[PDB]
Every structure is written in structure tokens, then in C-alpha cells.
Paper text:
The SRE enzyme AstD shares high sequence identity (61.3% with 91% coverage) with AthDHAD and catalyzes the identical β-dehydration reaction as AthDHAD, albeit with a more than 20-fold reduction in kcat. AstD, however, is completely insensitive to AA within the solubility limit (8 mM). The overall structures of AstD and AthDHAD are very similar, with an RMSD of 0.706 Å for 462 backbone Cα atoms. The main difference around the AA binding sites is the size of the substrate channel. The distance between V199 and G512 in AstD, the conserved residues forming the narrowest part of the active site entrance, is 7.7 Å, whereas the corresponding distance in AthDHAD is 8.0 Å. Overlay of the structures showed that 3 amino acid differences (V496L, V497I, and I177L) between the 2 enzymes may lead to a more constricted entrance. We reasoned that narrowing the entrance, along with other mutations away from the active site, may prevent the bulky AA from entering in the active site.
Here, we reveal the mechanism of AA inhibition on DHAD and the self-resistance mechanism of AstD, which is encoded by the self-resistance gene astD. Our structural and kinetic analysis of the mutant AthDHADs has validated the hypothesis that larger hydrophobic amino acids surrounding the active-site entrance enhance resistance to AA.
Numbering used by the authors: 69 to 82, 90 to 117, 125 to 185, 238 to 598
Write the structure that this text describes.
Amino acid sequence: MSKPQVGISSVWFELHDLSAIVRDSVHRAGLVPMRFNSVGVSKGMRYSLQSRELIADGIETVMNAQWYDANVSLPGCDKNMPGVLMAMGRTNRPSIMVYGGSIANTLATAIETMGMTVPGSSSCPADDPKKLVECENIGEVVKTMLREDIKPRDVLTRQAFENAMIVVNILGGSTNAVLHLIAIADSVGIKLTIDDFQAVSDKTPFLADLKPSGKYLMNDLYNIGGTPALLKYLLKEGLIDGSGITVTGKTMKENVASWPDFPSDQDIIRPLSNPIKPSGHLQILRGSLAPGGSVGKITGKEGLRFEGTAKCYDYEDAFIESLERGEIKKGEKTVVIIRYEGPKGGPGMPEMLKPSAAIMGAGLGQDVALLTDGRFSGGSHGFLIGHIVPEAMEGGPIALARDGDRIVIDAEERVVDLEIPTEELEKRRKEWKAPPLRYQKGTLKKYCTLVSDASHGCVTDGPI
């Protein structure tokens, strides 16, 4: 009739149907439910990052074409969450995310931290009947959001992203969170830079005893109070601000007041007294090889300086095959560059799992540093640096390095330097020629045309 219409956006690929429960709750609250579905992530890696744009574009399109008054989003898989939040920032109409439930991914905890979910959503397991009851009572949350006009730009403030980076830092830190939180902040009109991540990492310790290098899993947090208990603990220590409005109509502090604290005998989150590391893992490095920035998680076991000989590879398998031929030697310090894997070169910055694993399997973690304009995934006992800007496809210095060049990685200076003369670097750029875009037609052709560099979250509609 004249009731508000609530779009219910799912990202589904064929266990309860959470979307059907949301629909019945929205109807019971006096609103009109409108379920719709979106494609998502669910060689194949080259479509993953650009699927985030398809989610943001698709949901924005339906929300605006039909002009739904509010949004409930069920991203399902964790990898569908960023594009879901970007669509909310574009419409800026009252919206809420319902996490699918627990099944080291920190982004769902960070999204609840920012207040785009009811308390416990991100830590409640998918099995639990409490996940069903959350969706059974989401209708009144949406009606309250419409009554009090709680919009994504009211909730996703600059301080909300500060809390998100801190919580991510506390739990170990994701390098993908750099891409996604910058893009999500961009969608609500907030300028978030890689240097903002460095600032948090300098002042915030690492407290979560989590695998692969720790003892516990993120699923273990639910049994000691879940995400609300974690926020209560960080609020008690004064590390986060709880005064920000959320989708419930209350602040973070008000939301978590009624939830129980951590049990005193918990060893998943270290006390501030005894941190696993006094500063954050995530480090931003620039220098003559990555003047536009780069991203790496630094444990401290890599050492504080790595100077070595460059060996360059224009695709992932080229490195693995040169490794298997014994062209990378023990006792020598070698800096491996795997380039043309960036946003446009990949395309889509495909996550490479094999380079870091192959170096541990050969006992070279202390003799080999890894650099790329794309992404690494596994862990290495040496330097793992990605997101190097400009990428090789754009003609950055990473494309101009040659075998035999000296490269320095300094973790305290936070530079990756190509030890060649500036005149020579400019001469090499005058000889470089851009290869064609990998795809001349289709969705990847359009994505390559629009995508920004990694230091801007690879947003595709023009960084603010």
C-alpha cells in the first residue's frame, strides 16, 4: 500500500533460508518485503575482485530503480560482504547487514564493530537458532531505522573505520581489509588512506592468539562472549570509541552494556600487559620501487633489512618454474619480483598462494624476499609485500627492474628501493611499452578500464 518497501538483497549460490525468515519478519513489522538476489564470488581468481563491483553495482541498481525505502543484505559468503556494504553507501538509505554466521577472516567482526549489524551477528554461528531469531526480529530493527533515519553515512563515520582498523589490527590484520575498508569508506564519502592503516598499526598491539601461527580459531570467540564481549574488552582498555550510532538506534557502548564480558581465564585475546606483538603486523612501504605504496604483514622474524639481487617474473608460474630449475640459490639474498599481476595486469589482483608455499618447501624463507603488484596469500618467514603501486601494467618502477638490480627492503624506513640511478630509471621508462589489456571484450575489459590503483582500494567509479 503506502508502507515502506524493504529490499532484501541476497548473494546466493545453490541450513535454513535466512532470506525467507527476514521477509516474514519485515512483513510482520508492517513493512513490504522485496527479496532479490545478486551474483557474487561464492584464472577464476581474476573475476573475484571485480565481482565486488558487480555486487555494489547490481544492488545499487535495484535499490534505486525500484526505490526501496530500506535494505537488508545477506551476503552469505564472507567475500560478498564488501560489495554489499558499498551498495549501502551509495543509496545511503537505512540498511543493515545480517552475517550468515560462523562456519582468519576478520572483516565480519569489523563490520559489526562499525555498527552495520545487530550485536552478535558476526560471531553467532550459522548453526545456531539464535541466528534464526536474529532474522525473526530484523523487521523491527529496520522499522526503527526508518523512524529515526539511521543511514549508512550516519553510522559509517571516520571514527567507525578507526575502530574497524583497530579491531582488525587486534585480531592479526588483513591486507585485503586495506582494499575493502578503503573502498567501503570511499562509498560513504570518507577519505581513508594506506597511511591511516600505518598509524593504527603503530599505536595498536596484536592480542589474538589465532591460527595458523596461534592456538585458536575465530569460531572460538563465540563461546567466550563473541564480538560484543571483544568490544566490551577493547572499550574497557580505552582502545576504541563506543559513542558512535549503530543500526539499533543505540551507540556501541549502549549495545554491549547488556552483554556478558570475557571470562577471566580466557587466553584467546591477550591482555594489554602481555601482547603477542606491541605493534601491528600491517606495514606500509614506499621507496623508489613502490612510490605509490605497498602492503605487507611483518611478523618481526623477517629481520629489519633485506638487500638482495633482483630476479623478475611476468607471471606466477614463471617464478615457480625458475625455482624448480634451481635458478634461485641458497646463501644468496635474492629479491623475487612477480609483476603484471596487479588490478589491470592480473587482472583483478589474483591471490597467489604458490609462491610463498614453494619457498618454505625449499627452505629459502631467509634468502628470498617476495614482491608483487598483486596479492600473496600464504605466510612466509621472509618479506611478503604486495599491492605495489604503480603496478607493472601502468609502467611503475616495478616494471623497470631487471635481473641483477640491487633492491633494498628496510622495515624501519618502510621503503622498497630499486638501487639504480634515477637517470637510469627514467631511461628504462622511456624504453618500456605498455602491453595490451588482457581482455579486449567482456566484464574484465570494462573493469580494467575503470579500476584505480591498490592504494585507493581499487575503486572503479573515481576515488573521492
